[model samples]
Target chain A: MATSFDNLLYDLDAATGVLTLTVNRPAKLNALNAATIAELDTAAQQALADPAVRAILLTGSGEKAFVAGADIAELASLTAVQAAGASAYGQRVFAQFERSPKPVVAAVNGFALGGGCELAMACHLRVAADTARFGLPEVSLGLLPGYGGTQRLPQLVGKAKALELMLTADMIKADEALRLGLVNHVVPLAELLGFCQQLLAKMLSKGPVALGLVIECVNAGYDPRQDGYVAETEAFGRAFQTDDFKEGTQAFVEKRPAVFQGK
Target chain B: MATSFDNLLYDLDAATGVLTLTVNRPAKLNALNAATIAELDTAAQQALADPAVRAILLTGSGEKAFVAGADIAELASLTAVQAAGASAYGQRVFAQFERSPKPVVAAVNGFALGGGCELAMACHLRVAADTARFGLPEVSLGLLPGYGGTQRLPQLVGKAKALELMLTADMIKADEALRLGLVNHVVPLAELLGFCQQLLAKMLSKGPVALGLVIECVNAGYDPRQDGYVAETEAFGRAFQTDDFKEGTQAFVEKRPAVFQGK
Candidate 1:
């Protein structure tokens, strides 16, 4: 069955196994408000649980923004205490995208600012159109990214560039974003969706179990847990136990290519 | 008074600002003995504190190994407790290199294994000769990397590749090392020294104070401190407080090259 959440609009297109989640209120620059966050939370959980969806693509409906910012309408009505609570809530829910099991590709087509930037970062990888522009304008708003932004941004682009972008709150072109490792790839508006599809195709062809473990182990590097090394070792050993490993290794021995299943 | 230490051979022509510390004793493949670790700790500290020494180069003495493994000769006799203690010492000393202010580049000529790999990890960057072979072979010894090997190895190569290399103790070619981001660059044996010299010269032309802040903040990323953001913000504020920042900014604005003093 097709699904729609209160804050989000989603449909699982049967032919391609691609699930698309649209932050539907382009009139507000698709600015995330209470409903949007709830929808995002629900959609992400459902996507991971659904076996038919091989990939998930997140975007905004408007031509002007993938997401512009947190809904100013919501912010304008919030009291100081209410505003502070919202920031923490936003961080918690948005982080679900980063931690999700299914590979997420963000098609950042326009202004991705402040919370919008946070939204893009929530995904595993990104493909942006040439018209795409990015910024974390929170410092100008008398705030910092209470979300994983302050941390994850630095992890992507190195601390120097992260600090430079955050402190100045300057907008960057898509090309600059690609150079800084902020986005994996960039394309003109005509090919943006195609670029994303090609990437998704490549990712889906790899073993799902290996990809998930690889992502988990890599993300573990950012933590200080003692079990991180142990976890990585365990994950590597477990990967070898899968059928993909058997095929991949046998193919190597036979001097041919191996085929993988999502298994 | 001039100072020198054992295990590592240090020679500084202060007037030229070139400091070289050789991991000698190829008979042990320059595997860092405790004495070598001690010497390295002192040498790195000296290089950072001494204004007379502007740049430092670290290398193993021979073609056989930049460092083959920790002196297995000594390790061959080590008890479990002694082994644990040695790992602690290696981690501490290498942390010294990671924290050094002045540029420290590893000229990796041959085998950089186990503690040797961690030793190279301590440097800001590495230039490897085509013949160099690199790995963390501690797993083969029935131990995980005791030094900073487990931590720093993944930090450089990301998780999956680093896990594969370490768990299998697979030695990689210089070209593979470059591809994996384990080493900054590789050149033929004939070009190794020349390439490193060129790399160092390029680094020298940048603002030293700016570079110092860059080094500090970048290293701060691995720290669990929330102040990584605070420190990075402060560094961004402080970078401009240095002569280099002013020169760098002014040069960019004026469309000329920057002339930065160590200040």
Candidate 2:
């Protein structure tokens, strides 16, 4: 897969099977204006059509932000419907990344406020740098989180913590985010990108089909209406019923984990 | 408010604005049958209505169990429709307790598995005895958590921990539960009830309306929809509009903490 978009940057390294996507709008603090959100949506859609991209790394171009949030200047004058349309577009784009088959890891180097906090939440896992500070200061701005912040924030941290953060508009240190289970791992700022690459490499080593099922089973597990037991049972039974399953199960019986061939 | 249901066999105590409701069927090890659940629903509802009751305490009859799931024998012969209908009933009843004005504390003493865990999760806070073991072992019985377990469990613990527990159906020790944020506090078995009572007493000392609004705000905050936020903002705005708010703000200005009344 070729890295085509300039403003929407991507680098597919053939050696490591890692596809890094950067929001290269550092001048705007990489704020997700309308164009950036569109770029993200298009790139995610494009990723779905490509088989070569095994894993995704989401980050920003500079130390200032992963994505600071919406361009406030762009929103200085907007009707209610216009604002809703814009937010809905953002929600859709973030959800696209969340629902992608390939695992997405967010590498947070610095300020991830407002929509930036939300965008990080959209990914399956987050790898935050020590200097990263996260907040949803929208309430102070006479606004609210429009991009699944209210929902996903509570899903990550409990309701009490989420309320304390949102209502107070307090910025949390990276250590606090880690303690609250918001971010999976926190590394030194200089090592964030490499750490994310290492994490993605671990995920990529798992067979693609198995990785897909892991994502499916985990997401399905969270669904209130989902019979996650059935999903797991089917996934288990299906795996055991597969040739790869036989190879894997046999290898386990022989006292070693199997290397699955995308069979 | 007297706990006077013939179906309920627990010790009931109402004193100093706190009501304690214990699950007593020792022979069945406090398994919640249809009647017990009905009685619980009634007791929790009545607690909300009575002005004298500032808080409610939930627990099991003995040290052996804290209503360890539903009566499995009672569910053994149910048809699909019966199972689904029963689950819907459980969800409705739990939601009522969850949304109640008064904060309810679960003083879990022993095994709180399946429906038992669901009941505990419905409470505002849970303080478990050192002997308590929490699990949702329904998967082993060829069933799943039919109540609000699927939703509330994930809300308290993050997605990874929740899925692991439900999938493996493994029993977790009280200390493990507390460490994982599944339970708020875990004390020695002898100190469980008294510790819970002290906690409740502290909360009861707070202004009634203040406590009520606190519960309302947190539960209301859990919903991600715009309507939930609209309600939260209204409640926040209205809190400022109250006489209590005036007194509270005045007290803060005077360099002392606000002593608030329901006004």
Candidate 3:
């Protein structure tokens, strides 16, 4: 299925169940505004509801930026209460990405700053182009990362390094981002989405049920509300009850490739 | 001030407020027995109480291993309840490192596995010697890393890599560790302490109060109970009221270094 909005574009690959979402505000280097964020929320909901959408590739439309940042003009006018509300709204939306049942990969092709960086961090994995740069420059603007950057940045990078980067507002190149484990892969700009598609293909080949279970367990591991060990243990036990698990074990014993029905 | 304890050595540099802590049981490759854990708890309490201690460097006494692992012989005899108790005890001791007002940097010199790897993860930052190796080999023992390894490892490295390492029980070298964000820096064994000291010096030069605030805020960011942005906003507000903030901004304007008295 294909979805269209004023500020966003969505396309799903029928052959592979991969949904590619592009933030389409190139005039402003794909900076997110309130309307665009709302569109993202709507598009995400559509993707989640569609059974054909098994994975998502999120990126920007422009060659120069995956997203430059938030719309500064809109951000500058927020009152104190409005600022908090906006932050909470963005946080909730990104939290959905983190908690999504299907895997989402950010194919960052260029600059990802401020809210842009936070958005990428919310995904399960990130693949950056060599032209990509990532940073949270909110400090230099006399603000902190109002969205989930404060939470996710430290989770992605260790506390000391996260603090150093956040405080200094330093942008890191794709190589540095890969070195820091902020992104899973770094490729040339031309090959960014193809690499993401290949990576997603490998994961999508697994039993869908197992993939979702693993996603839940891993997401729970970072969540304070859940017990990761207990969750992993339960998931592991449940796997034994799945048809796919039985097939997987039997195929191993028989020296054959298992065909998973995603049970 | 000075303190003495068996199985451990502690020293504080008054000029720099840096404390060096060494695990001293070289005969068993400095493996963490229950007694050493208790000593660590006591040492951590003392360090936290001492205003003179601004940073901590944790390492083993010898080049062979930085506390090779938990004392396997001691762990093998535990019952279910006993194992849970031990895990909780060690978790509390290490949690202090995460919650500390001062920075704790692990100078991992060699084989950091099981409890040793968990110990390094507990610190705010880790600096591994080029000779260092890290792993969580508990799966091979038919056990899990009880001392917060399962939780912290995923937060440092991503969920997928952490799961792979924990499940396969594979040992990774210093370069891999650095690339995975398992350690902040990898240096020659001889320069490990000096590198950590220099890193500390740079951080120490910042306003002490702000440094503590940054630590607190960043730590809160990782914690589930706390709202990181709320904490950051509060801290950011509090910072503006501090003498350090005034001096810092003034120094920047005057093109001079800020002289912070830790107020």
Candidate 4:
């Protein structure tokens, strides 16, 4: 499938089956505007459906930011009602990455504030550059993070830290982000993408069906609406029916690596 | 309101509005039994209703344990149907701490395993002693955590770490817990209470109504049924109606500390 988006650059590695997506509005600090959010939703959908794409690595184009924040110019014009609608739209779009079958790794290279921070939290795993800074600074503008930041931030960092950051609008460094479990690893700015790609490559080598089950089960476990125990049981049963499981067990007994077919 | 419990000690500081509740079962390493759970539920309810009690500090009576686990001796006798009922009861009781309007801070001094770990997670914030250890080692007995552990552990630490701990039945020390976002702070055993007290004192100086609204809104954000944006909007509007908010902003401009009345 031919893939293109005005606000996003998608590069798929045919051999590794990893898709690298860059938010392309460098001049605007790659801030999330309504157009860019919609484009991200479309691009994420395309990546998930493409058999050539086994995993996704999301980042920004420039050195200054993964995303600085939402477009302040656009936000300044929104009425209360319009702002809520925008929040809901952005939330639904980001939920796509959170629930994606393929692992989506966020490589945060610089400032990820407000909506930018929320965007990274939606991914399955996150790696940050040593120079990256993260915050939900919406409170400073007499606003709160609307795009699931309140929900996901507390999930990553505990409620106390989440409330402290939101209410005080404090920015934390990459090391602090990793300590908070907001990001899995922190690397130098020059090595962020390489670190994430290698991480994804290891995950891509696992059984695709089992990998998908892990995503679904883990997401379901955190989601209040889903019963994690039941989800785990059902997924466990389903795994037994997959060809990958058979090969996986056989490989264990045969003392060799199992080649998964994405079956 | 008059508050007293046989298995727990409740001390309310009228001057600071901080109430400390200690599990008084040092003989059992503060292991939770049916009577202890009932007492906890009742005491928490009293704390919620009393205006003098603006915050709560939960801890174990002895130096060895904040809580070790649920009473395994009692649990061994319960049938499958009875075990489910017990799980439901414990979940509802802990949910009280989770949903409390006044912030509940847990001061974990030592072993916090199984139900004890769940109890700490239910609190709004946790401060651990340097000697503290945490785990949910229920899988060893072919049982899962019954008191919101399965749900809240993943919310505090990511699903991957939570699963690894639960599955492996491994115990992690205080520093690891701090790194995992499981505890807000880790201090020497001598300073655990003092550290938590200082933390709550800072929060107490803020607008009481605004503080309560922050708690309400943050909790609502995690609740699956609650729309976080709507809650934030409503809470923001509600804050404007409070005298504390008026005084808070005025104090900011006046360059002085605001005295909150809990109005």
Weakest ten-residue segment in model 3 chain B by summed lDDT: B232-241
- Cα lDDT tens digits, model 2, A5-116, are 6568977776766678898888888888777788788788877677777778889888878878676657544555566666666777887877777898999988899889
Candidate 2 or 1, higher TM-score: 1
Residue-wise C-alpha lDDT for candidate 4, range B118-221, written one tens digit per residue: 99999988899989999999999999999999899887887899999999999999999888789888999999899888877766655666556666778887
Clashes of 1: 0
Itemize residue pairs with steric clashes in candidate 3: none
Better of 1 and 3 by DockQ: 3
Model 4 chain A, TM-score vs. native: 0.96
Residue A93 lDDT in candidate 4 = 89
- Kindly provide the TM-score of model 3 when superposed on the true structure, using C-alpha atoms: 0.63
lDDT of 3 by residue, A180-250 (tens): 77998899999888999899989888877788889899988877778999999999999889999999889
Predicted candidate 3 versus true structure: per-residue lDDT over B1-263, tens digit per residue = 24888999998999999999999998888889899999999999999898899889899989979978887888888898999999999999999988886778899989898899999999988899989999999999899999999999987887899999999999999999888789888899999989989877866766666666666778786777986767755654555455665566566547687777766
Give a tens-digit lDDT track for model 1, residues B138-157: 43333445566656776887
RMSD of 1: 10.1
lDDT of each: 0.75, 0.76, 0.84, 0.84
Model 2: runs farther than 4 Å from truth? A240-243, A250-263, B1-263
Candidate 3 C-alpha error for residue A125, in Å: 10
TM-score of each: 0.59, 0.56, 0.63, 0.65
Give RMSD to native, each candidate. 10.1, 9.7, 7.8, 7.2
Candidates 1 onward: DockQ, in order: 0.07, 0.07, 0.14, 0.14
Q: Which parts of model 4 have CA positions greater than 4 angstroms off?
A: A1-57, A71-79, A99-104, A137-144, A150-171, A179-181, A194-263, B3-19, B22-39, B50-54, B60-90, B110-118, B133-184, B198-263
Contacts from the true interface found in each model, as a fraction, amount to 0.04, 0.05, 0.18, 0.14
What's model 2's overall lDDT? 0.76
